[PDB]
Design a protein around this nucleic acid. Structure first.
Lengths: 68, 62, 100, 8, 48, 142, 141, 72, 140, 84, 206
RNA sequence: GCGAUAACGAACGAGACCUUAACCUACUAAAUAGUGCUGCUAGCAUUUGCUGGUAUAGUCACUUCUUAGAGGGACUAUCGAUUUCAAGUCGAUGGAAGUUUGAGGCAAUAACAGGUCUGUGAUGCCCUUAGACGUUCUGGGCCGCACGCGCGCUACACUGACGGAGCCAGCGAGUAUAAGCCUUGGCCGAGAGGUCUGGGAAAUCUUGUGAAACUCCGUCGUGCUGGGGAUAGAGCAUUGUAAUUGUUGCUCUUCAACGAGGAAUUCCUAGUAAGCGCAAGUCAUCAGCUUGCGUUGAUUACGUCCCUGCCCUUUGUACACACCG
């Protein structure tokens, strides 16, 4: 299974609730964005956050997401 | 007198040990007589598996 | 002119890299031709010691490591110039050997 | 686990 | 046959006539102390 | 190529009180003789110009009489001492290769000698156990 | 077209060079070839008594052509195989040095080999000349 | 121990091999042994002759097995 | 210099150093012709990048390969990829990409291993067994 | 050769210093409770993120036991144990 | 059609493959077809192959094995019984030589024959066991085409393997007898007797 | 984790993390790595080429394959589907990699009469401490077999034995006035082994560890056969102060059961299982053993609670030293 954990899930939504206009539906842009937005000590960790922040971003287009 | 039926939906796993499955077939010819049947082998949707005999429904296996 | 070989060994790369860089730094601004550093294949010191001081229970093994990093730098310079470079670029972890 | 004994 | 070397040449090996025992295993409350000196409620109060 | 013959074969062969299958390849066939390995019959046939593509039954009387001469006189046909069986004997000190009937004879003859000198090896020989120090605690169950 | 030793299949060439070698006859045969084993791990002498030394010599000459100053110590590891230890697992076993040391001695006096500096045994000027010759008269058939 | 294959070739068998093999579709090492009762040693040597004279057409060349047929 | 590209196809450990220059139809293995690569039963495997596009592409290019490492079967697969990548690499550098994309489709549709090295590798043996996942038979 | 004794700046932050000091206070006749929380507060006083003192063995009784005194934040698995 | 002249000369026979890829460059996959409607998807015969040694990743996903060439699924099925594990080349030596034997017998296409040996021996219904915790109980159900593809081959190789056990007959010639006979529904050969009993008991269990 | 929610927000563990493996024609450089050129040199058809040798000054060029530091890259990426349209899952195309990318290391709260006082100059106490249970020394014993059990192997044959021909890996180790290291290369030896030099305190030299399976070509040809290698007899070496109760090997010789194994039961889902060898260990010699590596390389699943085991909830209690109650 490819279930993300809570530590990546809560860090992803705190970004949207702070920098939604700077977020995009493209992972690459978010990958580079979260580097200068949040101090992430692990490169593997950084890609997981952006990959689910984009999924949260790619979800808001189909309608309102619950809890954010 | 062997008849062929294509599967159109898989319902779930059955049998005591889970090695058999309940799958919804649809006959190759005369797309009627919908019968739920069991398969010993792994099943994707759209399998053309044939039937030794047709006049029997299927249930959960003990 | 003299053909002089400098070898750098350690356990931790970061201090070895500073020594490796600083020597090149002393070999660059001073117009001294060099050849190196040559990253020697790492040497791991492996022993598979048994966890149990006794001999009871399941079999688990301890396999401890020693990653050793070696480089060689050939220097074409007088011995007076090369000797002072090492003291400029000293580190307790890194041992320095100089040979002509 | 034994008691030592001599002969000579 | 005073020395053991010389007598060895005569002793027979009578082993394959007698049946070895059919059962030969010879190598229970682990939870009960056999010391009989139980530590008091006061000792733990002083020890701990 | 395949050949044809009649009467030159010999169904029952006899070399030194020992019976050899005539229909089996000769350099393998001699192994029925005690004192013959597959190693030994390889060479005693070769220097006798017994081509390996033949059987025991094809060899005429002449060839058999020559090979048994080499068989019983190996040192006389430059067969090496390291290729012989009983090298540096106790009684005479001459290299020997004990054979069909005479192999077990010096085998027994060696037994009572160690039994005569009450050596530990012959002591264990009388019982019938292992003598080379091998272990009987769990395996000597036959 | 320039025929070389590397251009011809090895299995049939070694038969052809040995076929030339046996008819040549200038290579001297030790008298123990019908007595000795190829290696310490063998159980039977080679089944071709009349040819095996020539087949061995022809291959060894060809094998050395491909590599550089290979000594006789290297040759034993080339031909050795898995010994049939009775109950223990197989172990790699060296070849007989007496045969191999004689062959490099034998092929050196016939002009195919010589002692190379810093160890080993180089292939000679004419050894390449004859081997590449025998190769040239190999693949026309 | 029911083989009883014969490896020495007599006159009774040589001509029959010239009478048996030509009436075959495909032969192998066992085929000459299975029905002609000749040994495998006699089987492989017979095939190397039955082919050289032109009676047999070689289908495949191999050491551990041989595939042959009639040339008629 | 002359037209040359450097490539390499990789297998288990076999890494196949293939050199393609500008010359004749010289395709050699360690300086020896491809007509005598062993095992001969898989001599067809190293031919696959030759006959898939046709042998005429090898008229103007010469191929010399050197491979060390791997295993005997691993050698067969690595050289196959190296010359197949050598064909594509040479076409990329000196020929239009119309050819590089066109010929690659023939190579892509027949086997992905013709271009990309597979990642299947042996996994380390762990203590408690003779194999990577296998363990000593347990006694009750 | 030359040996130099350097005064450790933060005594509480050093496990070796505090483990040794506890050994003396353990031998000084103090009860374990008074001794253990004298270094537990000392570590938290120096600014340590966490501290765990485990005094195990037998004490005035035949059966032996283990006793633990954790304070602050404590990580257990992974590299940061080797790091922090 | 022209002979392509290379400096490193290309043999004449392999130059024929410039038209079509063939197994051993002797067997053509154009005239090979599956005579069973449901077994076409799980028998891959569309992509021609040179040698039954492809070394793909067919066990990674659930149904990747359906794309494996039909010839490789038998040579993989050959190397069993421990000592033969990893002896794929030898198993291909068994398959290739057998196909040489297979063509001279019945005069049919060797790779068409093996497909027929796979469709005929596939049991369609098996009586699975439905024991209620220990007792002997059986229930008859169907068999999927994927299993009906794979069960026939494993039966086919087993009948090949025992035919050569303590037997002067070699494995390849046993296989050729095995494959052509089980292709025609021969009750004498293996993978028919073991199949027929499987469907026999399934009737009395439904 | 979604969700439901008298809970809300958090922490440890899991996951993260780290080591290793994969990709990088993009960097940094590589005479302890190689290649193409360049000399000088060779054999063949002479086609200017095909193969090689050499070159610590050809005082050649480069890092691409080999090494390793700096980095980069994947985050289920994008799409079709089902789902509480959520968490997710399943199929495609791209990709080097889409099973947590692969495999491992560290790893929670308390605890067990689990194992070790035979590792300690770690121990409290009992015993003993000069005719010592301390030491030292010689000789023996742990090997000793009427028997049952297991961890392995040798195989039970032709998918094979021998005999030739071919001939590829990777992980590792190796020294001085010693107490003798890896040992090449040469010379003697059927073999084992013996002699003389030299390299290497190490990507150089040992060692391309040319490992075996394997491919080919031959004999064998169903026979307990030439499958198998017990039990035993004779000589030559090695090691050690010392090999008898064979250290071991080697040479010859002896030519065993075993012809696939009952009731039962074990490991395992991909380079994994299983064949096949190699190195490090204890070691002066002794590997059928472990530890690691590499070669070949599959069958079938991708589901369930039927067995077993564990966990959670409900339930019951006269147990709490907790059913060994």
């Amino acid at each position: 299974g490819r279930v993300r954990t809570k530590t990546v899930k809560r860090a992803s939504k705190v970004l949207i609730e702070r920098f939604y206009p700077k977020l995009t539906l493209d992972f690459e842009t978010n990958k580079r964005l979260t580097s200068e937005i949040a101090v992430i000590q692990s490169k593997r960790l950084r890609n997981k956050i952006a990959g689910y922040t984009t999924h949260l971003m790619k979800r808001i287009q189909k309608g309102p997401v619950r809890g954010i | 007198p062997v008849t062929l039926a294509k599967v159109i939906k898989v319902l779930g796993r059955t049998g005591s040990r889970g090695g058999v499955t309940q799958v919804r077939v649809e006959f190759l010819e005369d797309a009627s007589r919908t019968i739920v049947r069991n398969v010993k082998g792994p099943v994707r949707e759209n399998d053309i598996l044939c039937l030794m005999e047709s006049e029997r429904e299927a249930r959960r296996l003990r | 002119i003299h053909k002089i070989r400098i070898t750098l060994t350690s356990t931790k790369v970061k201090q070895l890299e500073n020594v490796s860089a600083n020597i090149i730094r002393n070999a660059a601004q001073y117009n001294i031709v060099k050849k190196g550093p040559v990253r020697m294949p790492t040497k791991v010191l492996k022993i598979t010691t048994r966890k149990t001081p006794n001999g009871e229970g399941s079999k688990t093994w301890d396999a401890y490591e020693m990653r050793i990093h070696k480089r060689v730098i050939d220097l074409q310079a007088p011995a007076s110039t090369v000797k002072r470079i090492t003291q400029i670029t000293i580190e307790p972890g890194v041992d320095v050997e100089v040979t002509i | 686990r034994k008691k030592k004994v001599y002969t000579t | 046959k005073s020395p053991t070397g010389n007598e060895a040449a005569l002793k027979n090996k009578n082993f394959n006539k007698d049946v070895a025992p059919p059962q030969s295993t010879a190598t229970p409350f682990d939870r009960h102390s056999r010391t009989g000196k139980t530590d008091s409620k006061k000792k733990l109060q002083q020890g701990w | 190529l395949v050949v044809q013959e009649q009467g030159s074969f010999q169904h029952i062969l006899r070399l030194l009180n020992t019976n050899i299958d005539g229909r089996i390849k000769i350099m393998y066939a001699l192994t029925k003789i005690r004192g013959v390995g597959r190693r030994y019959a390889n060479l005693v046939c070769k220097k006798a110009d017994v081509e390996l593509t033949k059987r025991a039954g094809e060899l005429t009387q002449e060839e058999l009489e020559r090979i048994v001469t080499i068989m019983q006189n190996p040192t006389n046909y430059k067969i090496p001492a390291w290729f012989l069986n009983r090298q540096k004997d106790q009684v005479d000190g001459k290299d020997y290769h004990v054979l069909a009937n005479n192999l077990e004879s010096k085998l027994r003859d060696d037994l009572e000698r160690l039994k005569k000198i009450r050596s530990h090896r012959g002591i264990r020989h009388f019982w019938g156990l292992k003598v080379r120090g091998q272990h009987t605690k769990t395996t000597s169950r036959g | 077209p320039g025929v070389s030793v590397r251009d011809v299949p090895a299995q049939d060439f070694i038969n052809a060079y040995a076929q030339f070698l046996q008819r040549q006859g200038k290579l001297e045969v030790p008298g123990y070839v019908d007595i000795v084993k190829t290696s310490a791990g063998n159980d039977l002498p080679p089944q071709e008594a009349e040819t095996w030394f020539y087949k061995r010599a022809a291959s060894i000459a060809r094998h050395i052509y491909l590599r550089k100053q290979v000594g006789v110590g290297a040759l034993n590891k080339l031909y050795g195989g898995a010994k049939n230890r009775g109950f223990r697992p197989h172990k790699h076993v060296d070849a007989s040095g007496s045969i191999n040391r004689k062959c490099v001695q034998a092929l050196q006096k016939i002009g195919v080999l010589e002692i190379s500096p810093k160890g080993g045994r180089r292939i000679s000027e004419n050894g390449q000349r004859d081997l590449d010759r025998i190769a040239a008269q190999t693949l026309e058939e | 121990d029911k083989a009883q294959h014969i490896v020495i070739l007599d006159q009774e068998k040589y001509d029959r091999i010239l009478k048996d093999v030509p009436t075959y579709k495909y032969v192998s090492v066992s085929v000459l042994v299975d029905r002609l009762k000749i040994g495998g040693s006699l089987a492989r040597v017979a095939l190397r002759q039955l082919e050289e004279d032109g009676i047999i057409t070689p289908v495949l060349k191999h050491s551990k097995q041989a595939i042959y047929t009639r040339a008629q | 210099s002359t037209q040359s590209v450097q490539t390499f196809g990789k297998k288990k450990t076999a890494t196949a150093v293939a050199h393609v220059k500008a010359g004749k139809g010289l395709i050699k293995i360690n300086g020896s012709p491809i007509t005598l690569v062993q095992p001969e039963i898989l001599r067809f495997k190293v031919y696959e990048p030759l006959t898939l596009v046709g042998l005429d592409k090898f008229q103007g290019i010469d191929i010399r390969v050197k491979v060390t490492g791997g295993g005997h079967v691993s050698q067969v697969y690595a050289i196959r990829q190296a010359i197949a990548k050598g064909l594509v690499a040479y076409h990329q550098k000196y020929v239009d990409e119309a050819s590089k994309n066109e010929l690659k489709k023939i190579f892509a549709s027949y086997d992905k291993t013709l271009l990309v090295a597979d990642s299947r590798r042996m996994e380390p043996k762990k203590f408690g067994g003779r194999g990577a996942r296998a363990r000593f038979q347990k006694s009750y | 050769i030359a040996i130099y004794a350097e005064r450790v700046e933060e005594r509480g932050l050093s496990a070796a210093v505090q483990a040794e000091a506890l050994k003396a206070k353990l031998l000084s006749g103090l009860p374990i409770r008074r001794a253990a929380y004298g270094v537990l507060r000392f570590a938290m006083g120096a600014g340590a993120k966490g501290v765990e003192v485990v005094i195990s063995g037998k004490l005035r009784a035949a059966r032996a036991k283990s006793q633990k005194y954790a304070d602050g934040f404590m990580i257990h698995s992974g590299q940061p144990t080797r790091d922090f | 059609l022209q002979v392509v002249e290379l400096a490193t000369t290309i043999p004449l026979d392999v130059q024929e493959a410039q038209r079509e890829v063939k197994l051993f460059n002797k067997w053509s996959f154009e005239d090979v077809e599956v005579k069973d409607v449901s077994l076409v998807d799980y028998i891959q015969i569309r992509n021609p192959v040179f040698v039954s040694h492809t070394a793909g990743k067919y066990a990674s996903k659930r149904f990747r094995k359906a794309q494996c060439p039909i010839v490789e699924r038998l040579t993989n099925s050959l190397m069993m019984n421990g000592r033969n594990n990893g002896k794929k080349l030898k198993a291909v030596r068994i398959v290739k030589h057998a196909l040489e034997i297979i063509h001279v017998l019945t005069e049919q296409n060797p790779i068409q024959v093996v497909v027929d040996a796979i469709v005929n021996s596939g049991a369609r219904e098996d009586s699975t066991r439905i024991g209620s915790s220990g007792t002997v109980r059986r229930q008859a159900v169907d068999v999927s085409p994927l299993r009906r593809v794979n069960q026939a081959i494993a039966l086919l190789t087993i009948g090949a393997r025992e035919a050569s056990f303590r037997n002067i007959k070699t494995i390849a010639e046993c296989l050729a007898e095995e494959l052509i006979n089980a292709a025609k529904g021969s009750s004498t050969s293996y993978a028919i007797k073991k199949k027929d009993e499987l469907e026999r008991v399934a009737k009395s269990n439904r």
